[PDB]
From a paper:
To combat these defenses, Anopheles mosquitoes produce inhibitors belonging to the SG7 protein family that block complement at the alternative C3 convertase, C3bBb. Crystal structures of albicin and SG7.AF reveal a novel four-helix bundle arrangement that is stabilized by an N-terminal hydrogen bonding network. In this study, we describe the structures of albicin and its orthologs SG7.AF (from An. freeborni) and anophensin (from An. stephensi), characterize the binding and mechanism of AP inhibition by these inhibitors, and determine a role for properdin in modulating the inhibitory activity of SG7.AF.
Anophensin, the albicin ortholog from An. stephensi, has been shown to inhibit the contact pathway of coagulation through binding with factor XIIa and high-molecular-weight kininogen (29). We evaluated the AP inhibitory activity of recombinant anophensin in the erythrocyte lysis assay and found it to be much less potent than albicin or SG7.AF with an IC50 value of approximately 350 nM in NHS and 6 μM in PDS. We obtained crystals of a variant of anophensin containing three additional amino acids at its N-terminus. In the crystal, anophensin occurs as a symmetrical dimer in a domain-swapped arrangement where a number of the amino acid interactions in albicin between α1 and the rest of the bundle are retained but are now intermolecular. The extended coil region linking α1 and α2 also becomes helical, creating several new intermolecular interactions that may stabilize a dimeric form of the protein in solution. Nevertheless, the anophensin structure with its extended N-terminus suggests that the α1-α2 region of the 30 kDa family might be unable to form the N-terminal hydrogen bonding network seen in albicin and SG7.AF and possibly assume a partially unfolded structure that could be relevant for the interaction with collagen.
Residue numbers in the entry:
A (entry chain A): 2 to 119
B (entry chain B): 3 to 120
Amino acid sequence: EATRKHVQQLMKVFRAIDFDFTKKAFYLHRAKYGVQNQLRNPLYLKAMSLPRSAKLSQPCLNKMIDEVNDLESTFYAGFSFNCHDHDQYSMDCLEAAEPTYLDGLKKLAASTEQCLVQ
Amino acid sequence: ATRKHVQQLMKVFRAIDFDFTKKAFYLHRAKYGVQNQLRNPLYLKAMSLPRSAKLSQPCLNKMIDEVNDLESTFYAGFSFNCHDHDQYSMDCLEAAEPTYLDGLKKLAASTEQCLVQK
């Protein structure tokens, strides 16, 4: 029996939902590699060029972690429900929210560098 | 020479990595939620329709919107609306996921009553 037209229309709606989940997984991937590139890697540089007798400020690592969380929450809000004038999870929402997030991690990597030793 | 500070920084960035993996596991659970409670039942419902049956597009749109609202609410329950446990734990997951599954199975039934345009 030929594939019913309405089966194809039903599956069309579910394709777009599956793709919605894909777009969300792309968001996560960008957010993770944002952290690696703007934050982890430059701070790995600072750590290796340090005197054997240096103590690390864990209040500073604590501020960084919670500041990672707030930047990432704000990135997901920009990608999703807080996208000022775009479809739900578009690439156009990412284009607006990602630079803010990466510039946030960049600034955070600088202030973390400054409080790292003590 | 200074293996100590580097290992100490990796510990913090290891955890952020795993946090991203917990968020990806959430997303897979939400995906297989839609497949099991919504997609698979609605496909059976459709193959039992008369072959001529035409679908109601407004019904399908109500279904996509409600999937996003339900998943928006699941993720909130996974994070900032958890309160009683830490921000992306399995505990937060296990508390909010039945409500999400229950909501999808409800939407599987409300969509069935409107699926055919008669």
